[PDB]
């Protein structure tokens, strides 16, 4: 037979692998990644000023951030209008930024009693219980009064440094570059990030009105209790405007087909394990299918839930007079990126599950390394002939064609002729003999004798692979 | 750079509905016969 047990399961597995590959390929954001890289280059590599040498990646003092906010950060981001937000007139930032400072409360530690005559107090690391809540210095408004974590749309994250919650002083930027610079100068003059601070952060959004990509950019700085601070930045490309045109329709159709295939596979594999041999886990073939189905279902559900609501972007675009709570959206985007990495791992697992015909993994390298040798040997003859013809054309048609003018251009001309972009108007006109002869001989020796030798080599390689497999695998 | 769609009535010129309905009424879409599917938008049979 081998038509229902050896021609369907393998074909279905191959189709599932193809669908997974298509779904993975339809998840690479090129423009968003380029925009994030450009923003990081204009921000992370931005120094303090023209004469200062304090960059985002070189945080060494409490005045590095203050000097950075007025300078290159005001040139690559706070560019004047033609006060809009467009440095090269093409990077349109979305909304306005916001600043937060999770500082240690006044008296966040204790001094020794034996040395109480000289030691006053200390400050601990950033944490939920180590975040200031009362005023810190002159607090006219919210510039030095910490906002509640629940009341300021903040929560613990537990990043690379500590679990900085939403507690801490909060402030909002302005709608003008000059006003933002003035506010930054006012905050730097006063005690905003004092010695009793533990962490700082800033959150902005980028729209780039020419490109449909609204992302968030969050910079952070961990001020350790042992002096100094370490800054960093992170870009979250979270968007929910995917449904645009025929490409979006194709992506949605592929997603629906993948969901239907997963449902069909679950239906087909949920009957032969219930009314049949159960508890099969260490079989390398029964647990793998169940794990793959469960992982696919979980990933599909997580992806669907990540885009449950799309009203955040619409609300931000309708009213852009403040900084929206984009931290939750950035966290969701980070979780989506982690899910995408997990889906790449699941695609690798599916490829492994497509290896049910094993033992053909490393016993054939000796033949591939011989086919490579044959191809390398062929490439020498092909290139010798090609350069001989190119030199002939360059010497004969050198001064009268505008196509065989320079030697570096004759090669491209012959390549285009090979691909089928022949002109043949000047070639015959520039020389009625040795013009047609060159073209005719070139075509005959490049499409009938030398291009058919490339195929014969691979034909022989395939035939010998088939022969040696059908010999050794079917002999012992 | 696109948003929602208008659905209300407006008088001669633009919005100033004085007596009843705007002289430029909405003319709600027909039950069947629409969806032109534009360059990068999808419309219906409704409109002024």
Short mmCIF file of C-alpha atoms in Angstrom, two decimals:
data_model
loop_
_atom_site.label_atom_id
_atom_site.label_comp_id
_atom_site.label_asym_id
_atom_site.label_seq_id
_atom_site.Cartn_x
_atom_site.Cartn_y
_atom_site.Cartn_z
CA UNK A 1 0.00 0.00 0.00
CA UNK A 2 2.04 2.91 1.40
CA UNK A 3 -0.59 5.39 0.18
CA UNK A 4 -2.41 6.18 3.45
CA UNK A 5 0.26 5.46 6.09
CA UNK A 6 3.46 6.49 4.26
CA UNK A 7 2.17 9.14 1.82
CA UNK A 8 -0.03 11.29 4.09
CA UNK A 9 1.71 11.69 7.45
CA UNK A 10 4.99 12.76 5.83
CA UNK A 11 3.17 15.07 3.40
CA UNK A 12 1.12 16.58 6.23
CA UNK A 13 4.26 17.13 8.31
CA UNK A 14 6.00 18.79 5.36
CA UNK A 15 2.99 21.05 4.77
CA UNK A 16 2.90 21.99 8.46
CA UNK A 17 6.61 22.81 8.35
CA UNK A 18 6.06 24.96 5.25
CA UNK A 19 3.19 26.79 6.96
CA UNK A 20 5.34 27.37 10.06
CA UNK A 21 8.18 28.71 7.89
CA UNK A 22 5.77 31.06 6.10
CA UNK A 23 4.34 32.29 9.41
CA UNK A 24 7.86 32.88 10.76
CA UNK A 25 8.90 34.76 7.61
CA UNK A 26 5.79 36.92 7.97
CA UNK A 27 7.02 38.19 11.33
CA UNK A 28 10.31 40.00 10.54
CA UNK A 29 9.93 43.77 10.97
CA UNK A 30 12.58 45.39 8.78
CA UNK A 31 11.46 49.03 8.80
CA UNK A 32 10.65 48.97 12.52
CA UNK A 33 14.07 47.49 13.31
CA UNK A 34 15.78 50.09 11.11
CA UNK A 35 13.89 52.92 12.82
CA UNK A 36 14.75 51.56 16.27
CA UNK A 37 18.42 51.25 15.30
CA UNK A 38 18.46 54.81 13.95
CA UNK A 39 16.83 56.12 17.14
CA UNK A 40 19.35 54.23 19.28
CA UNK A 41 22.26 55.55 17.22
CA UNK A 42 20.95 59.11 17.51
CA UNK A 43 20.33 58.62 21.25
CA UNK A 44 22.60 55.98 22.81
CA UNK A 45 25.69 57.22 20.94
CA UNK A 46 24.72 60.87 21.48
CA UNK A 47 27.23 62.67 23.75
CA UNK A 48 26.40 65.42 26.24
CA UNK A 49 27.40 68.41 24.10
CA UNK A 50 29.94 69.45 21.47
CA UNK A 51 32.75 69.85 24.01
CA UNK A 52 31.57 67.43 26.71
CA UNK A 53 32.36 63.71 26.60
CA UNK A 54 29.41 62.24 28.52
CA UNK A 55 27.32 59.83 26.43
CA UNK A 56 24.38 57.58 27.24
CA UNK A 57 26.63 54.49 27.22
CA UNK A 58 29.30 56.29 29.32
CA UNK A 59 27.28 57.19 32.42
CA UNK A 60 29.89 58.05 35.06
CA UNK A 61 28.46 61.00 37.04
CA UNK A 62 25.16 62.57 38.07
CA UNK A 63 25.82 65.47 35.66
CA UNK A 64 26.20 63.20 32.61
CA UNK A 65 22.43 62.88 32.12
CA UNK A 66 21.83 66.57 32.86
CA UNK A 67 24.44 67.61 30.29
CA UNK A 68 23.15 65.01 27.82
CA UNK A 69 19.54 66.25 27.98
CA UNK A 70 20.74 69.70 26.81
CA UNK A 71 22.85 69.02 23.74
CA UNK A 72 22.96 66.09 21.33
CA UNK A 73 19.68 64.81 22.78
CA UNK A 74 18.23 68.23 21.91
CA UNK A 75 19.67 68.01 18.37
CA UNK A 76 18.81 64.45 17.32
CA UNK A 77 15.41 64.53 19.02
CA UNK A 78 14.34 68.09 19.90
CA UNK A 79 14.78 69.50 16.40
CA UNK A 80 12.95 72.68 15.45
CA UNK A 81 10.03 72.72 13.02
CA UNK A 82 9.93 74.21 9.51
CA UNK A 83 8.54 73.12 17.44
CA UNK A 84 7.91 69.71 15.86
CA UNK A 85 9.97 66.52 16.34
CA UNK A 86 11.91 65.75 13.15
CA UNK A 87 15.72 65.73 13.14
CA UNK A 88 16.25 64.89 9.45
CA UNK A 89 12.66 66.00 8.63
CA UNK A 90 11.77 62.30 8.37
CA UNK A 91 11.81 60.98 11.97
CA UNK A 92 8.45 62.14 13.36
CA UNK A 93 8.23 61.38 17.08
CA UNK A 94 4.81 60.54 18.50
CA UNK A 95 3.29 62.48 21.37
CA UNK A 96 5.51 63.81 24.15
CA UNK A 97 7.94 62.10 26.52
CA UNK A 98 7.60 61.53 30.26
CA UNK A 99 10.18 61.19 33.03
CA UNK A 100 10.11 59.11 36.21
CA UNK A 101 12.53 58.88 39.14
CA UNK A 102 12.34 56.02 41.65
CA UNK A 103 14.36 57.50 44.51
CA UNK A 104 15.11 56.23 48.00
CA UNK A 105 12.99 57.75 50.75
CA UNK A 106 14.46 60.28 53.17
CA UNK A 107 16.22 57.95 55.58
CA UNK A 108 16.07 54.70 53.61
CA UNK A 109 18.78 53.12 55.79
CA UNK A 110 20.45 53.55 59.18
CA UNK A 111 23.85 54.68 60.44
CA UNK A 112 25.83 52.73 63.07
CA UNK A 113 25.33 53.78 66.67
CA UNK A 114 29.06 53.47 67.41
CA UNK A 115 29.74 55.99 64.61
CA UNK A 116 26.60 58.12 64.93
CA UNK A 117 28.70 61.28 65.43
CA UNK A 118 29.91 61.21 61.81
CA UNK A 119 27.57 58.92 59.81
CA UNK A 120 24.16 60.35 58.93
CA UNK A 121 22.32 57.79 56.76
CA UNK A 122 22.52 55.73 53.57
CA UNK A 123 20.35 54.70 50.62
CA UNK A 124 19.44 51.18 49.51
CA UNK A 125 18.87 49.81 45.99
CA UNK A 126 15.67 50.40 44.03
CA UNK A 127 12.77 48.16 45.07
CA UNK A 128 9.04 48.24 45.80
CA UNK A 129 9.61 48.92 49.51
CA UNK A 130 12.67 51.12 48.85
CA UNK A 131 10.94 53.77 46.71
CA UNK A 132 10.34 57.29 48.00
CA UNK A 133 6.76 58.41 48.55
CA UNK A 134 6.96 61.70 50.51
CA UNK A 135 8.40 64.99 49.21
CA UNK A 136 12.11 65.17 48.36
CA UNK A 137 13.32 68.76 48.46
CA UNK A 138 11.22 71.68 47.23
CA UNK A 139 8.02 70.07 45.93
CA UNK A 140 5.84 72.81 44.48
CA UNK A 141 3.84 70.24 42.52
CA UNK A 142 4.57 66.79 41.11
CA UNK A 143 8.18 67.71 40.27
CA UNK A 144 9.34 66.30 43.62
CA UNK A 145 6.24 64.48 44.96
CA UNK A 146 6.22 60.76 44.19
CA UNK A 147 3.15 59.31 42.48
CA UNK A 148 1.59 56.01 43.55
CA UNK A 149 2.46 52.95 41.48
CA UNK A 150 -1.21 52.11 40.90
CA UNK A 151 -2.13 55.78 40.37
CA UNK A 152 0.65 56.45 37.82
CA UNK A 153 0.23 53.31 35.64
CA UNK A 154 3.37 51.62 36.93
CA UNK A 155 4.34 48.17 38.11
CA UNK A 156 7.39 46.11 38.99
CA UNK A 157 9.43 44.73 36.10
CA UNK A 158 12.48 43.05 37.69
CA UNK A 159 14.82 43.90 34.84
CA UNK A 160 18.59 43.64 34.60
CA UNK A 161 19.22 45.72 37.75
CA UNK A 162 16.26 45.58 40.16
CA UNK A 163 12.46 45.50 40.38
CA UNK A 164 11.77 49.21 39.98
CA UNK A 165 8.03 49.59 40.55
CA UNK A 166 5.80 52.48 39.49
CA UNK A 167 6.50 54.52 42.62
CA UNK A 168 8.61 57.65 42.39
CA UNK A 169 8.43 61.24 41.18
CA UNK A 170 6.80 61.77 37.78
CA UNK A 171 6.91 64.60 35.26
CA UNK A 172 5.62 65.32 31.76
CA UNK A 173 7.41 67.09 28.92
CA UNK A 174 6.07 69.94 26.77
CA UNK A 175 5.04 70.38 23.13
CA UNK A 176 8.04 72.55 22.21
CA UNK A 177 11.76 71.81 22.04
CA UNK A 178 12.64 75.12 23.72
CA UNK A 179 10.10 74.47 26.49
CA UNK A 180 11.44 70.93 26.98
CA UNK A 181 15.00 72.26 27.23
CA UNK A 182 13.89 74.90 29.74
CA UNK A 183 12.10 72.26 31.83
CA UNK A 184 15.19 70.03 31.73
CA UNK A 185 17.38 72.94 32.86
CA UNK A 186 14.95 73.75 35.68
CA UNK A 187 14.92 70.11 36.81
CA UNK A 188 18.73 69.95 36.71
CA UNK A 189 19.11 73.19 38.69
CA UNK A 190 16.86 71.84 41.46
CA UNK A 191 17.19 68.56 43.35
CA UNK A 192 15.36 66.10 41.07
CA UNK A 193 17.73 63.11 41.02
CA UNK A 194 19.56 63.70 44.29
CA UNK A 195 22.08 61.52 46.13
CA UNK A 196 19.15 59.68 47.72
CA UNK A 197 17.97 58.32 44.37
CA UNK A 198 18.05 54.77 43.03
CA UNK A 199 16.76 54.70 39.43
CA UNK A 200 15.60 57.00 36.64
CA UNK A 201 13.63 56.42 33.45
CA UNK A 202 12.14 58.24 30.48
CA UNK A 203 9.54 57.09 27.96
CA UNK A 204 8.80 58.57 24.53
CA UNK A 205 6.98 57.47 21.39
CA UNK A 206 7.95 57.59 17.72
CA UNK A 207 5.52 57.75 14.80
CA UNK A 208 7.58 58.61 11.69
CA UNK A 209 4.46 59.86 9.91
CA UNK A 210 5.88 58.84 6.53
CA UNK A 211 5.97 55.20 7.73
CA UNK A 212 3.13 53.29 9.40
CA UNK A 213 5.13 52.28 12.48
CA UNK A 214 4.32 53.74 15.91
CA UNK A 215 6.77 52.40 18.49
CA UNK A 216 7.89 53.26 22.02
CA UNK A 217 11.40 54.07 23.26
CA UNK A 218 12.22 53.78 26.97
CA UNK A 219 15.56 54.84 28.42
CA UNK A 220 16.54 53.71 31.90
CA UNK A 221 19.38 54.38 34.33
CA UNK A 222 20.26 52.32 37.40
CA UNK A 223 21.87 54.49 40.08
CA UNK A 224 23.60 51.97 42.37
CA UNK A 225 24.00 52.55 46.09
CA UNK A 226 27.80 52.38 45.59
CA UNK A 227 27.88 55.56 43.51
CA UNK A 228 27.45 56.16 39.79
CA UNK A 229 24.74 54.96 37.43
CA UNK A 230 24.42 52.70 34.39
CA UNK A 231 22.15 53.84 31.52
CA UNK A 232 20.52 51.85 28.73
CA UNK A 233 17.69 52.06 26.21
CA UNK A 234 15.04 49.71 24.81
CA UNK A 235 12.74 50.08 21.80
CA UNK A 236 9.38 48.29 21.65
CA UNK A 237 7.78 48.16 18.15
CA UNK A 238 4.18 47.50 19.20
CA UNK A 239 1.60 48.07 16.46
CA UNK A 240 -1.99 46.96 15.85
CA UNK A 241 -2.64 48.36 12.37
CA UNK A 242 -1.57 45.24 10.48
CA UNK A 243 -4.71 45.01 8.31
CA UNK A 244 -3.71 47.36 5.48
CA UNK A 245 -3.61 45.85 1.99
CA UNK A 246 -3.21 42.61 0.03
CA UNK A 247 -0.11 41.66 2.02
CA UNK A 248 -2.15 41.86 5.23
CA UNK A 249 -4.87 39.75 3.59
CA UNK A 250 -2.28 37.12 2.64
CA UNK A 251 -0.86 37.11 6.18
CA UNK A 252 -4.33 36.72 7.69
CA UNK A 253 -5.19 33.91 5.26
CA UNK A 254 -1.95 32.13 6.16
CA UNK A 255 -2.69 32.51 9.88
CA UNK A 256 -6.22 31.14 9.43
CA UNK A 257 -4.92 28.21 7.38
CA UNK A 258 -2.31 27.46 10.05
CA UNK A 259 -4.98 27.54 12.77
CA UNK A 260 -7.20 25.19 10.75
CA UNK A 261 -4.29 22.82 10.12
CA UNK A 262 -3.44 22.81 13.84
CA UNK A 263 -7.08 22.04 14.69
CA UNK A 264 -7.17 19.21 12.14
CA UNK A 265 -3.91 17.76 13.48
CA UNK A 266 -5.24 17.91 17.04
CA UNK A 267 -8.45 16.17 15.96
CA UNK A 268 -6.52 13.47 14.10
CA UNK A 269 -4.07 12.88 16.98
CA UNK A 270 -6.53 13.09 19.91
CA UNK A 271 -8.29 9.80 19.04
CA UNK A 272 -5.38 7.36 18.66
CA UNK A 273 -4.06 8.16 22.16
CA UNK A 274 -7.33 8.05 24.11
CA UNK A 275 -9.03 4.88 22.84
CA UNK A 276 -5.54 3.46 22.32
CA UNK A 277 -2.20 3.08 24.13
CA UNK A 278 -2.04 5.93 26.65
CA UNK A 279 0.65 7.39 28.93
CA UNK A 280 3.20 7.11 26.10
CA UNK A 281 5.81 9.74 27.00
CA UNK A 282 9.27 8.21 26.49
CA UNK A 283 8.55 7.10 22.92
CA UNK A 284 10.16 10.03 21.01
CA UNK A 285 7.16 9.94 18.65
CA UNK A 286 3.95 10.17 20.73
CA UNK A 287 4.88 12.85 23.28
CA UNK A 288 6.46 15.06 20.60
CA UNK A 289 3.23 15.43 18.62
CA UNK A 290 1.20 16.28 21.73
CA UNK A 291 3.83 18.79 22.88
CA UNK A 292 3.92 20.41 19.44
CA UNK A 293 0.12 20.67 19.30
CA UNK A 294 -0.07 22.13 22.81
CA UNK A 295 2.71 24.63 22.11
CA UNK A 296 1.12 25.71 18.82
CA UNK A 297 -2.27 26.21 20.49
CA UNK A 298 -0.72 28.17 23.37
CA UNK A 299 1.30 30.37 21.01
CA UNK A 300 -1.76 31.07 18.84
CA UNK A 301 -3.80 31.98 21.91
CA UNK A 302 -1.06 34.24 23.26
CA UNK A 303 -0.71 35.99 19.90
CA UNK A 304 -4.48 36.48 19.68
CA UNK A 305 -4.65 37.85 23.24
CA UNK A 306 -1.74 40.23 22.61
CA UNK A 307 -3.87 42.01 19.98
CA UNK A 308 -7.13 41.81 21.95
CA UNK A 309 -7.56 45.60 21.88
CA UNK A 310 -6.20 48.14 19.40
CA UNK A 311 -7.80 51.25 20.90
CA UNK A 312 -4.60 52.49 22.60
CA UNK A 313 -3.00 53.71 19.37
CA UNK A 314 -6.25 55.24 18.12
CA UNK A 315 -6.74 57.08 21.42
CA UNK A 316 -3.14 58.32 21.36
CA UNK A 317 -3.53 59.58 17.78
CA UNK A 318 -6.88 61.27 18.46
CA UNK A 319 -5.53 63.06 21.56
CA UNK A 320 -1.75 63.57 21.76
CA UNK A 321 -1.56 66.23 24.50
CA UNK A 322 0.20 63.96 27.02
CA UNK A 323 2.29 60.80 27.32
CA UNK A 324 0.11 57.65 27.26
CA UNK A 325 0.75 54.68 29.53
CA UNK A 326 2.77 52.83 26.90
CA UNK A 327 4.78 50.84 29.47
CA UNK A 328 2.17 48.06 29.51
CA UNK A 329 2.16 47.98 25.71
CA UNK A 330 5.97 47.80 25.68
CA UNK A 331 5.87 44.91 28.16
CA UNK A 332 3.30 43.15 25.96
CA UNK A 333 5.56 43.70 22.94
CA UNK A 334 8.53 42.25 24.84
CA UNK A 335 6.40 39.23 25.75
CA UNK A 336 5.44 38.94 22.07
CA UNK A 337 9.12 38.99 21.10
CA UNK A 338 9.80 36.24 23.64
CA UNK A 339 6.88 34.29 22.16
CA UNK A 340 8.41 34.80 18.70
CA UNK A 341 11.70 33.35 19.93
CA UNK A 342 9.74 30.45 21.43
CA UNK A 343 8.00 30.03 18.06
CA UNK A 344 11.39 29.88 16.32
CA UNK A 345 12.33 27.16 18.81
CA UNK A 346 9.03 25.42 18.02
CA UNK A 347 9.80 25.61 14.29
CA UNK A 348 13.13 23.94 15.05
CA UNK A 349 11.23 21.30 17.03
CA UNK A 350 8.89 20.79 14.07
CA UNK A 351 11.90 20.35 11.79
CA UNK A 352 13.18 17.74 14.25
CA UNK A 353 9.75 16.06 14.13
CA UNK A 354 10.17 16.03 10.33
CA UNK A 355 13.30 13.90 10.80
CA UNK A 356 11.38 10.62 11.28
CA UNK A 357 13.52 9.25 8.41
CA UNK A 358 16.79 9.44 10.33
CA UNK A 359 20.36 8.12 9.85
CA UNK A 360 20.58 10.27 6.70
CA UNK A 361 22.27 13.19 8.40
CA UNK A 362 26.07 12.84 8.16
CA UNK A 363 26.76 9.78 5.98
CA UNK A 364 26.39 11.79 2.75
CA UNK A 365 28.86 14.65 3.35
CA UNK A 366 31.55 12.86 1.32
CA UNK A 367 29.36 13.08 -1.80
CA UNK A 368 28.36 16.72 -1.27
CA UNK A 369 32.02 17.66 -0.82
CA UNK A 370 32.73 15.97 -4.18
CA UNK A 371 29.86 17.74 -5.92
CA UNK A 372 31.27 21.00 -4.56
CA UNK A 373 34.66 20.08 -6.03
CA UNK A 374 33.07 19.39 -9.42
CA UNK A 375 31.20 22.71 -9.36
CA UNK A 376 34.39 24.57 -8.41
CA UNK A 377 36.19 22.89 -11.31
CA UNK A 378 33.39 23.91 -13.68
CA UNK A 379 33.44 27.53 -12.48
CA UNK A 380 37.04 27.92 -13.69
CA UNK A 381 36.21 26.88 -17.26
CA UNK A 382 33.06 29.01 -17.28
CA UNK A 383 34.92 32.11 -16.11
CA UNK A 384 37.84 31.57 -18.50
CA UNK A 385 35.41 31.48 -21.42
CA UNK A 386 33.46 34.45 -20.04
CA UNK A 387 36.51 36.70 -19.66
CA UNK A 388 37.82 35.64 -23.08
CA UNK A 389 34.54 36.75 -24.66
CA UNK A 390 34.50 39.92 -22.56
CA UNK A 391 38.00 40.87 -23.71
CA UNK A 392 37.02 40.23 -27.33
CA UNK A 393 33.95 42.45 -27.00
CA UNK A 394 35.87 45.19 -25.19
CA UNK A 395 38.58 45.27 -27.86
CA UNK A 396 36.21 45.17 -30.85
CA UNK A 397 33.24 47.26 -29.62
CA UNK A 398 35.34 49.38 -27.27
CA UNK A 399 35.06 52.87 -28.73
CA UNK A 400 31.69 52.96 -30.48
CA UNK A 401 28.91 51.35 -28.40
CA UNK A 402 28.67 53.14 -24.99
CA UNK A 403 27.97 49.67 -23.56
CA UNK A 404 31.33 47.99 -24.15
CA UNK A 405 33.13 51.17 -23.07
CA UNK A 406 34.86 50.11 -19.84
CA UNK A 407 35.98 46.60 -19.00
CA UNK A 408 34.08 46.59 -15.69
CA UNK A 409 30.94 47.27 -17.75
CA UNK A 410 31.40 44.60 -20.44
CA UNK A 411 30.96 41.94 -17.74
CA UNK A 412 27.63 43.42 -16.67
CA UNK A 413 26.57 43.74 -20.31
CA UNK A 414 27.28 40.06 -20.95
CA UNK A 415 25.49 39.08 -17.74
CA UNK A 416 22.43 41.04 -18.87
CA UNK A 417 22.62 39.33 -22.27
CA UNK A 418 22.66 35.99 -20.44
CA UNK A 419 19.59 37.00 -18.43
CA UNK A 420 17.94 38.13 -21.67
CA UNK A 421 18.49 41.89 -21.96
CA UNK A 422 20.13 41.99 -25.39
CA UNK A 423 20.14 45.24 -27.37
CA UNK A 424 21.75 44.13 -30.68
CA UNK A 425 21.07 47.55 -32.21
CA UNK A 426 24.56 49.04 -31.80
CA UNK A 427 26.41 45.71 -31.94
CA UNK A 428 25.44 45.12 -35.57
CA UNK A 429 25.64 48.82 -36.47
CA UNK A 430 29.09 49.31 -34.92
CA UNK A 431 30.41 46.34 -36.91
CA UNK A 432 28.47 44.35 -39.50
CA UNK A 433 31.03 41.55 -39.26
CA UNK A 434 32.39 40.20 -35.96
CA UNK A 435 29.33 41.84 -34.44
CA UNK A 436 26.81 39.18 -35.41
CA UNK A 437 29.51 36.51 -35.18
CA UNK A 438 30.35 37.44 -31.59
CA UNK A 439 26.70 37.41 -30.51
CA UNK A 440 25.84 34.15 -32.28
CA UNK A 441 28.89 32.24 -31.02
CA UNK A 442 28.38 33.63 -27.50
CA UNK A 443 24.75 32.49 -27.43
CA UNK A 444 25.56 29.07 -28.88
CA UNK A 445 28.43 28.40 -26.46
CA UNK A 446 26.66 29.87 -23.42
CA UNK A 447 23.15 28.40 -23.75
CA UNK A 448 23.65 25.08 -25.57
CA UNK A 449 27.00 23.63 -24.49
CA UNK A 450 28.12 25.30 -21.28
CA UNK A 451 24.84 25.79 -19.42
CA UNK A 452 23.86 22.17 -20.09
CA UNK A 453 27.07 20.99 -18.43
CA UNK A 454 26.04 22.59 -15.15
CA UNK A 455 22.84 20.57 -15.12
CA UNK A 456 24.52 17.28 -16.07
CA UNK A 457 26.91 17.54 -13.12
CA UNK A 458 24.02 17.88 -10.67
CA UNK A 459 22.10 15.13 -12.46
CA UNK A 460 25.02 12.75 -11.94
CA UNK A 461 25.36 13.83 -8.31
CA UNK A 462 21.68 13.13 -7.64
CA UNK A 463 21.85 9.79 -9.45
CA UNK A 464 24.87 8.66 -7.42
CA UNK A 465 23.28 9.78 -4.14
CA UNK A 466 20.18 7.77 -5.02
CA UNK A 467 22.33 4.79 -5.99
CA UNK A 468 24.42 4.72 -2.82
CA UNK A 469 21.39 5.20 -0.56
CA UNK A 470 19.34 2.52 -2.33
CA UNK A 471 22.41 0.28 -2.04
CA UNK A 472 23.50 0.65 1.58
CA UNK A 473 20.16 1.45 3.24
CA UNK A 474 18.41 -1.38 1.34
CA UNK A 475 21.27 -3.92 1.53
CA UNK A 476 21.98 -4.03 5.28
CA UNK B 1 -2.53 59.62 8.69
CA UNK B 2 -6.22 58.68 8.67
CA UNK B 3 -8.88 58.43 11.36
CA UNK B 4 -12.63 57.90 11.64
CA UNK B 5 -15.57 58.90 9.47
CA UNK B 6 -18.27 61.54 9.82
CA UNK B 7 -21.89 60.49 10.30
CA UNK B 8 -23.87 63.68 11.01
CA UNK B 9 -25.80 66.39 9.14
CA UNK B 10 -24.61 69.83 8.07
CA UNK B 11 -26.32 72.85 6.53
CA UNK B 12 -25.26 74.92 3.53
CA UNK B 13 -21.55 75.64 3.72
CA UNK B 14 -20.74 73.38 6.65
CA UNK B 15 -22.00 72.50 10.14
CA UNK B 16 -24.90 74.72 11.27
CA UNK B 17 -28.09 72.61 11.54
CA UNK B 18 -30.83 75.17 12.19
CA UNK B 19 -34.37 73.92 11.57
CA UNK B 20 -34.46 70.19 10.87
CA UNK B 21 -31.85 68.05 9.15
CA UNK B 22 -28.78 69.46 7.44
CA UNK B 23 -29.28 70.52 3.82
CA UNK B 24 -26.36 68.15 3.15
CA UNK B 25 -27.70 65.00 4.79
CA UNK B 26 -25.69 61.83 5.43
CA UNK B 27 -27.71 59.52 3.13
CA UNK B 28 -27.04 56.31 5.08
CA UNK B 29 -25.65 53.41 3.01
CA UNK B 30 -27.99 51.13 1.11
CA UNK B 31 -28.63 47.63 2.43
CA UNK B 32 -26.96 45.97 -0.55
CA UNK B 33 -24.45 47.33 -3.07
CA UNK B 34 -21.24 48.89 -1.77
CA UNK B 35 -17.66 48.10 -0.70
CA UNK B 36 -15.56 49.76 -3.41
CA UNK B 37 -12.30 48.71 -1.70
CA UNK B 38 -10.10 51.73 -2.42
CA UNK B 39 -6.33 51.96 -2.78
CA UNK B 40 -5.81 51.62 0.99
CA UNK B 41 -9.32 51.96 2.40
CA UNK B 42 -12.66 50.15 2.22
CA UNK B 43 -15.78 52.28 1.77
CA UNK B 44 -19.52 51.65 1.44
CA UNK B 45 -22.52 53.17 -0.34
CA UNK B 46 -23.02 55.86 2.32
CA UNK B 47 -21.97 59.48 2.11
CA UNK B 48 -23.12 63.00 1.29
#
